[PDB]
Design a protein around this nucleic acid. Structure first.
Ligand SMILES: Nc1ncnc2c1ncn2[C@@H]1O[C@H](CSCC[C@H](N)C(=O)O)[C@@H](O)[C@H]1O
Lengths: 97, 108, 94, 324, 81, 76, 97, 86, 105, 95
DNA sequence: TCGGATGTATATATCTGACACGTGCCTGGAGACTAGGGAGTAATCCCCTTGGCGGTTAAAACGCGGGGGACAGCGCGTACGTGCGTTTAAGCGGTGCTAGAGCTGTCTACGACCAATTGAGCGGCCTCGGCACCGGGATTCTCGA
DNA sequence: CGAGAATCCCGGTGCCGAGGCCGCTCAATTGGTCGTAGACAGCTCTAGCACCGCTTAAACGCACGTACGCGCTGTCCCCCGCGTTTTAACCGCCAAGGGGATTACTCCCTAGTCTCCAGGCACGTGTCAGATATATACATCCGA
């Protein structure tokens, strides 16, 4: 019944995700999401799969930068765990909305 | 009746003087385009490309690789001091991020 | 048969070989570098255009490119890039 | 009237004393000069504690006459020490550190007598009249053992007080210097002639130098750059035309050219490829020299001059890699 | 027409992005909050990209339109033109 | 006939030379067995740069004249 | 010996400074600061006094926006008082440096 | 009086209550002491960023003078656009 | 012959001056017909929105003369124009009167 | 003796169209002047980038419409779209 | 919870000097006519995109100890407020003043524009080799001891 | 610290993109012209620029004192780690199909030239909205 303590299984594969970097997002449900949220702006929008992969890369890096600054928010709050008030804080300071 | 030289060799360089001059005309940037301007601009791109591929080949040899993949360009950007400040508003696909561990999340 | 689209690929090849003799590039990274140089080109062109707008010219010269380089690049990057342009325009002059 | 210690011509002074500003003008200067005479061979502090006190009224010609006559009696006492079976003085000996700092400030006061028209100069060109303290130059001299062969070049000498510091410091044969802006070149001639008279008045050796009123574009300076190893200019406000031209001048030089810069010609961590064969950082080692480093200069941050030192072993090991 | 696809961004996927960003421990509301933020960001970009594609009088979304919308976002993703 | 060059790497290079060989011929040979671009390769022959319009025997370069690899840098 | 508690003399004149808005920065030492820090980039830089007032307005609003987001940092840290780690946090999240 | 027109110490000119005055503008109930030095450093770096740009504008316009237009275009390139002057 | 092509399009912002800036601005080879017309119309509508928000603060403060404080409160108290002009700064006005939650005792 | 072509009288006329019984300070006039040049240059550069991005050489009203729908927040953008639509319609009917 | 006591808007005489309104003029802005070339459309043709079937399967979803962070308060000392002398430098408002910024008259470099001329530069064809991948085995944390 | 749990790396196997080479444009490049744009003399004039009187608000320090920061302590609860059980992910295959690049082929829209012209911008004006002195009620705080 060997089981690691928490934080281990965090930091190992934090290392693997920071090194092995491909998409880390299942692009078929992602692509169905993009097709749905684009369908409401205009019906019958053909894509390029290259364009949807570009969207995946952009959203990936966007949420990762948001996560990093949000992690800085939680560290500055002296909290190991991230709560979504950190996210709202970071989006307020960056001035998205 | 002399033979045609080339302006990049006339500049003693590698980047296309003619293509940059054509894009400056077709870019609708000014009404007219100076003579030394695309030369200077091709030099600026030459230095930037050389500087980024220096660090790209550095990261590639650090991973002992020959075909430079986007990972090494990503690391070449965000590992350099001035280049990251240049390219803070810049995102590069297929690279992921730096090895970034917040040390307070590390255990004892 | 395809239409001769522009790219910077042979020049990235020349730069890549002249910095490292037996180093390659992935084609994704090739398109990345092409988009990068087009980005930097558009930035410097727009800034020189705004400068010529701000001083009422018609012909952007290497003076304006030098100034926009000095505006846009951080620090020692600019300090070497202007010298690269200095050497190159000097070689092109004669 | 303050003599050289070998009984030579006295440094004659006007009454009133030459007013340059309010903060540390020439009244305090003569007093500190004889405070460095207290820092010399001590046969005068016995009289300097007496009535040359810090309490005295402004424009004390009484303290001036006291100071001059006590110094004349001190030089007469040193002469009564000399004139037996004793040699008077070794000529070629050098001034010490804070002594030479006083000497350069002294040449600055007694030569630079109009900083106002020195401030009133022309627009953007390498005419930027920014100068360097005694101390970074002194530490740089400590960093670079300028021999009788390793001379100094200041293309764009300004007023060349740095060159005088190098001359009075090292064991060099000669030094160079040139200048483009007219008011500081005329005042640099004043600095030259006065400082030579000053080192006469101290009886101590200053090394030779050539300060000029001219340019650097000529092939004469190409040849002289190829001759002389150790070179500095405060290049920071020159523009990359001039600086790259000077790189091209430095290309033809000998190995180990201990060349200091202010703004560097190459990064301190420079690496070679095949592109930069035309460039200049390949054939030299680019290292940072130590600043003041207590420097409320022009910059509140320290100044941090930068040494270049010629080394083509980088490029020859690059040739070994080209074999590889 | 489609549905449920914002939850198609999965709990492991947000977890994988978090473990890339350096997140040690996640809370529960992080998932729905991140889905909402992603949805707002994607609407802002995709509306612009659709504006480009319709302005070209074309029906097919290119990579370049996404590139131009990210240029409006001050982000400017490379790899595509 | 065979002459030499004392490099600043100290490589006493074997030079397959003949009095019929030019200066550029030896420069291309130094490019061959040194990898060096011949744009700069001044060789100290009694304090003279050798010029490709002449040959070795035009300067009357004696054999075992151990020259010196000087780099008149013509990236320039 | 009438003396207010702290927080009063904060919030009154927080109201007055948010309403009565002119410069709230002594423009002569400010102007000497600007002349000094510009002097190092280039000697002998004549100004326009309008330009220096523009600099004062810009720096005023810049530091006030920094203060507001920094106050949000301290509130999110559950701290009433602002420490300069909040400032470093806010400049990191905004991505100045 | 006078010598070379050199300013050497003016960071204190952003004074202790004026920083406090701007913090009360920002709506701060209570301020630590290190905010003073930190804020002086931050403003100094920000002013370096703007003033390099405005000086560069003056050099390209080949003047000797900092106009308001130079400052406005400098802040325009900062991505922090200011109005009221051009 | 007074023509006033803005009023011929029913507007207030100048056709010829905006067309002058478009021809000077190097924005394309040619300037389209309805382009400065549509441009001046959108400018006029946005400026009308701004001044409509400024007059409200003029009512708020018993002022018959619009001030930078009026402009500041008008821009910041909007929702969408605040989003448009968040990277935009106005001199001489100040900020919103804004007190946080946990500072009030 | 010189010309600094402000847009002050336009602000006068629009202010008398929307709030006729209030004035403006010249400081506020310069603020609005910088505002108008900002909005103009942003829409103009947006349309110029669009013209280069779709390989065409003549920026027209559809291009400015796309530029507005990109650059402005959306509901106010659709308002300004309808305003300029009716205005260009009035230019066509009264050419 | 309200006496004392505050600096808090409200109200009103008295400047005043910034701000709305003629003015005049001239100087950039509005029609007539060309033209030619960007651009709109007719046609089409290939080609990438969508959609579906099927096979695998990694990967996602519940769940369940458990253990580590969140979090509530405390108390204690600390630093940060506050009125107040003091003290200190800052602003307002006079002076000249001059250095630098804006307008003008060439004019000559000096770059748009067309036309030979062709060769660098791109579409496409083997190819092969750095890399993808897999499999084995040495190497390195680890977490309950 | 020792069994386990990954993990690094070594090496063998193959493979599909890079990449060198092949043909063939058309865009660069030479060589011309031809207008014209900023460049430099050269000039007015105004606007920072010291300076100082001279008052003066305000900063600076300082004894107090107090609300806060935070180390700490239970506590609790909720995410984490790995396990078992689904489930579309994903990879390839077939097949249409419409949509995006193309040629072709006019066409009409705007650049440009010329000419009138009127309205925008100094300029100068009155002039009156508000700034400020002086008094006057009042949301809130000290505190019993
Ligand atoms: N090419 C050149 N030839 C001669 N002098 C030059 C020059 N370029 C610039 N200068 C002069 O170099 C001087 C530098 S000012 C330096 C001051 C002094 N050397 C010091 O630092 O202590 C300027 O006055 C300028 O006139």
């Amino acid at each position: 019944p060997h089981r690691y303590r928490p934080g281990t299984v965090a930091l190992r594969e934090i290392r693997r995700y920071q090194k092995s970097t491909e998409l880390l997002i299942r692009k078929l449900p992602f692509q169905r999401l993009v097709r749905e949220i684009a369908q409401d702006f205009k019906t019958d929008l053909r894509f390029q799969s290259s364009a949807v992969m570009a969207l995946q890369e952009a959203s990936e890096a966007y949420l990762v930068a948001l996560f990093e600054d949000t992690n800085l928010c939680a560290i500055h709050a002296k909290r190991v765990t991230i709560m979504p008030k950190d996210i709202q804080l970071a989006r307020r300071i960056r001035g998205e909305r | 009746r002399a033979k045609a030289k080339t302006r990049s060799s006339r500049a003693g360089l590698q980047f296309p003087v003619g293509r940059v001059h054509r894009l400056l005309r077709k870019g609708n940037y000014a009404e007219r385009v100076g003579a030394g301007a695309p030369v200077y601009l091709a030099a600026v791109l030459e230095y930037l490309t050389a500087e980024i591929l220096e660090l790209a080949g550095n990261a590639a040899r650090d991973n002992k690789k020959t075909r430079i993949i986007p990972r090494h360009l990503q690391l070449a950007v965000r590992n350099d001091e001035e280049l990251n400040k240049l390219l803070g508003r810049v995102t590069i696909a297929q690279g992921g991020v730096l090895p970034n561990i917040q040390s307070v999340l590390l255990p004892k | 048969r395809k239409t001769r689209k522009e790219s910077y690929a042979i020049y990235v090849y020349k730069v890549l070989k002249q910095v490292h003799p037996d180093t390659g590039i992935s084609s994704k990274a090739m398109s990345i570098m092409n988009s990068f140089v087009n980005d930097v080109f558009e930035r410097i062109a727009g800034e020189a255009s705004r400068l010529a707008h701000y001083n009422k010219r018609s012909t952007i010269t290497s003076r304006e490119i030098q100034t926009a380089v000095r505006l846009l690049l951080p620090g020692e990057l600019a300090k070497h890039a202007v010298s690269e342009g200095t050497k190159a325009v000097t070689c092109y002059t004669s | 009237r303050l003599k050289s210690p070998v009984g030579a011509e006295p440094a004659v002074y006007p009454w009133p004393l030459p007013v340059y500003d309010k903060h540390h003008d020439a009244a305090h200067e003569i007093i500190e000069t004889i405070r460095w005479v207290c820092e010399e061979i001590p046969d005068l502090k016995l009289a300097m504690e007496n009535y040359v006190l810090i309490d005295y009224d402004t424009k004390s010609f009484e303290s001036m006459q006291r100071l001059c006559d006590k110094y004349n009696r001190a030089i007469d006492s040193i002469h009564q020490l000399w004139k037996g079976t004793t040699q008077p003085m070794k000529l070629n000996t050098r001034p010490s550190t804070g002594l030479l700092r006083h000497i350069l400030q002294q040449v600055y006061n007694h030569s630079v007598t109009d900083p106002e028209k020195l401030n009133n100069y022309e627009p953007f060109s390498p005419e930027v009249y920014g100068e360097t303290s005694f101390d970074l130059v002194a530490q740089m001299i400590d960093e670079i053992k300028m021999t009788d062969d390793d001379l100094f070049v200041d293309l764009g000498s300004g007023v060349g007080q740095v060159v005088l510091q190098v001359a009075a410091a090292t064991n060099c044969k000669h030094h160079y210097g040139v200048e483009k802006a007219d008011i500081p070149a005329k005042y640099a001639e004043t600095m030259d002639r006065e400082f030579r008279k000053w080192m006469k008045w101290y009886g101590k050796k200053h090394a030779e130098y050539t300060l000029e009123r001219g340019d650097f574009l000529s092939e004469e300076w190409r040849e002289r750059i190829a001759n002389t190893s150790v070179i500095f200019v405060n290049n920071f406000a020159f523009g990359p035309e001039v600086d790259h031209q000077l790189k091209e001048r430095f290309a033809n030089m000998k190995e180990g050219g201990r060349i200091v810069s202010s703004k560097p010609f190459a990064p301190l961590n420079f690496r070679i490829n095949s592109r930069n064969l035309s460039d200049i950082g390949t054939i030299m080692r680019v290292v940072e020299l130590s600043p003041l480093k207590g420097s409320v200069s022009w910059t509140g941050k320290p100044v941090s001059y930068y040494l270049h030192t010629i080394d083509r072993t980088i490029l020859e090991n690059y040739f070994s890699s080209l074999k590889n | 027409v489609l549905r449920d696809n914002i939850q198609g961004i999965t709990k492991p996927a947000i977890r994988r992005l978090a473990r890339r960003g350096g997140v040690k421990r996640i809370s529960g509301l992080i998932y729905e909050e991140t889905r909402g933020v992603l949805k707002v960001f994607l609407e802002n970009v995709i509306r612009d990209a659709v504006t480009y594609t319709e302005h070209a009088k074309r029906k097919t979304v290119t990579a370049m339109d996404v590139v131009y919308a990210l240029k409006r976002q001050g982000r400017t993703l490379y790899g595509f033109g | 006939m065979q002459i030499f060059v004392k490099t600043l790497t100290g490589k006493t290079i074997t030079l397959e030379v003949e009095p019929s060989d030019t200066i550029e011929n030896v420069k291309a040979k130094i490019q061959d067995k040194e990898g060096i671009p011949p744009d700069q390769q001044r060789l100290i022959f009694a304090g003279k740069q050798l010029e490709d319009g002449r040959t070795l025997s035009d300067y009357n370069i004696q054999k075992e004249s151990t020259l010196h690899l000087v780099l008149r840098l013509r990236g320039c």
